[PDB]
Design a protein around this motif. Structure first.
Motif, PDB file in Angstrom:
ATOM      1  N   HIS A  19       1.691   4.436  -2.786  1.00  0.00           N
ATOM      2  CA  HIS A  19       1.718   6.084  -2.851  1.00  0.00           C
ATOM      3  C   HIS A  19       2.729   6.611  -3.504  1.00  0.00           C
ATOM      4  O   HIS A  19       2.476   7.757  -3.986  1.00  0.00           O
ATOM      5  N   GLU A  32      -5.848   6.927  -0.878  1.00  0.00           N
ATOM      6  CA  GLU A  32      -5.961   5.669  -0.021  1.00  0.00           C
ATOM      7  C   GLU A  32      -6.387   4.426  -0.737  1.00  0.00           C
ATOM      8  O   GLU A  32      -5.906   3.369  -0.637  1.00  0.00           O
ATOM      9  N   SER A  45      -3.867   2.617  -3.181  1.00  0.00           N
ATOM     10  CA  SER A  45      -3.076   1.934  -2.371  1.00  0.00           C
ATOM     11  C   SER A  45      -3.655   0.651  -1.686  1.00  0.00           C
ATOM     12  O   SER A  45      -2.843  -0.202  -1.736  1.00  0.00           O
ATOM     13  N   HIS A  62       0.990  -1.143  -0.101  1.00  0.00           N
ATOM     14  CA  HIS A  62       0.120   0.020   0.050  1.00  0.00           C
ATOM     15  C   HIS A  62       0.824   1.255  -0.054  1.00  0.00           C
ATOM     16  O   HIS A  62       0.860   2.458  -0.639  1.00  0.00           O
ATOM     17  N   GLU A  63       1.725   1.328   0.903  1.00  0.00           N
ATOM     18  CA  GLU A  63       2.725   2.572   1.071  1.00  0.00           C
ATOM     19  C   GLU A  63       3.675   2.891  -0.143  1.00  0.00           C
ATOM     20  O   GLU A  63       3.553   3.948  -0.451  1.00  0.00           O
ATOM     21  N   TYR A  75      -3.605  14.721  -0.937  1.00  0.00           N
ATOM     22  CA  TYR A  75      -4.044  13.912   0.222  1.00  0.00           C
ATOM     23  C   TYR A  75      -5.143  14.641   1.046  1.00  0.00           C
ATOM     24  O   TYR A  75      -5.100  14.712   2.292  1.00  0.00           O
ATOM     25  N   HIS A 106      -9.096   7.944   4.971  1.00  0.00           N
ATOM     26  CA  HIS A 106      -9.104   6.524   5.460  1.00  0.00           C
ATOM     27  C   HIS A 106     -10.338   6.278   5.692  1.00  0.00           C
ATOM     28  O   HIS A 106     -10.477   4.696   5.776  1.00  0.00           O
TER      29      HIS A 106
HETATM   30 ZN   LIG Z   1      -2.215   5.250   2.700  1.00  0.00          ZN
END
Ligand SMILES: [Zn+2]
Ligand SMILES: [Ca+2]
Ligand SMILES: [Ca+2]
Ligand SMILES: [Ca+2]
Ligand SMILES: [Ca+2]
Length: 316
Positions: free
Chosen positions: A146, A166, A169, A142-143, A157, A231
């Motif tokens: 980004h 999000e 990701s 996931h990270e 963001y 999120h």
């Molecule tokens: Zn994230």
């Protein structure tokens, strides 16, 4: 580091044994020269000063409990790199083989992991909420995803663009987990999240409302926390991606699943060709619909299921 490429062995966070690509030069470094301009893993040694020191080991065997988070950050970075290379023909996050750097053992009791604009940072967790975050292949992917988003669409963001950010990701984190075949599922961070509680996770793509997230646009969070619910409102998109792939009936809307390979291609194309920095959900639907059209044709089942899944979550 200037040395000889080699292969070491160690144990990850969950105790599994694995080989890792290392580099010898007096010490054995977590430096993988077989992928682009390199995969480099650093030890933050429980501080916040980044990046810390290139990880150095004396005999090339990484079986201590302190080593475990390093092993995994280095390996899953390698796996994510290969996913993007082999499945989407993309070489590193910048599409030019930029070196990938990670720091582990960041701070004390740190319950998170993030991309800081130049590298991956992993906390060790507090032992109750988290164990070392680099243990989760989906967390890692996931990270790093980004970093791919920053170099391509540039989703900012916050608000709906941040929620898309999000969701992308979580989507690509999940597909890397399937690509590695590493016990796959549609949940986010279940291998490291709450070690004393079995079956739970941070988020769910297949049923986001299980952990409090919205699964329809009418349920969307419109407050100001979490940068505008980046999120939280990602569950709307996660849910949609899950329907596209696996299919299902959701608020009475039935969707025929087209599979993970097609989901990945449709979302990789939207991401790198139609999404802009301030795209909103509606624009994401259009982008996705255009991408399926480009790939499979305007009257294909593929287009039909993109549209049906956006309709099932209320995004027009
Ligand atoms: Zn994230
Ligand atoms: Ca050692
Ligand atoms: Ca899993
Ligand atoms: Ca997962
Ligand atoms: Ca758990």
């Amino acid at each position: 580091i200037t040395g000889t490429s080699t292969v070491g062995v160690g144990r990850g966070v969950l105790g599994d044994q694995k080989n890792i690509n290392t580099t010898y030069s007096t010490y054995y470094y977590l430096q993988d020269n077989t992928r682009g301009d390199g995969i480099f893993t650093y030890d933050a040694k429980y501080r916040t000063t980044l990046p810390g020191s290139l990880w150095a080991d004396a005999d090339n065997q990484f079986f201590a409990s302190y080593d475990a988070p390093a092993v995994d950050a280095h390996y899953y970075a390698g796996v994510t790199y290969d996913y993007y290379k082999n499945v989407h023909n993309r070489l590193s996050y910048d599409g030019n083989n930029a070196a990938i750097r990670s720091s582990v053992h960041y701070s004390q009791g740190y319950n998170n992991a993030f991309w800081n604009g130049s590298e991956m940072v992993y906390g060790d967790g507090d032992g109750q909420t988290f164990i070392p975050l680099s243990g989760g292949i989906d967390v890692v992917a996931h990270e790093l995803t980004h970093a791919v988003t920053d170099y391509t669409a540039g989703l900012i963001y916050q608000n709906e663009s941040g929620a898309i950010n999000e969701a992308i990701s979580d989507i690509f984190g999940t597909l890397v987990e399937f690509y590695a075949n590493k016990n796959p599922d549609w949940e986010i961070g279940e291998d490291v999240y709450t070690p004393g509680i079995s079956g739970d996770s941070l988020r769910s793509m297949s049923d986001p409302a299980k952990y409090g997230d919205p699964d329809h646009y009418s349920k969307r969070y419109t407050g100001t926390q979490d940068n505008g619910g980046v999120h939280i409102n990602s569950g709307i998109i996660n849910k949609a991606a899950y329907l596209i792939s696996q299919g299902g009936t959701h608020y009475g809307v039935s969707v025929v699943g087209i599979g993970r390979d097609k989901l990945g291609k449709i979302f990789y194309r939207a991401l790198t060709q139609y999404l802009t920095p301030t795209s909103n959900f509606s624009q994401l639907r259009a982008a996705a619909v255009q991408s399926a059209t480009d790939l499979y044709g305007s009257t294909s089942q593929e287009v039909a299921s993109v549209k049906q899944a956006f309709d099932a979550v209320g995004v027009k």
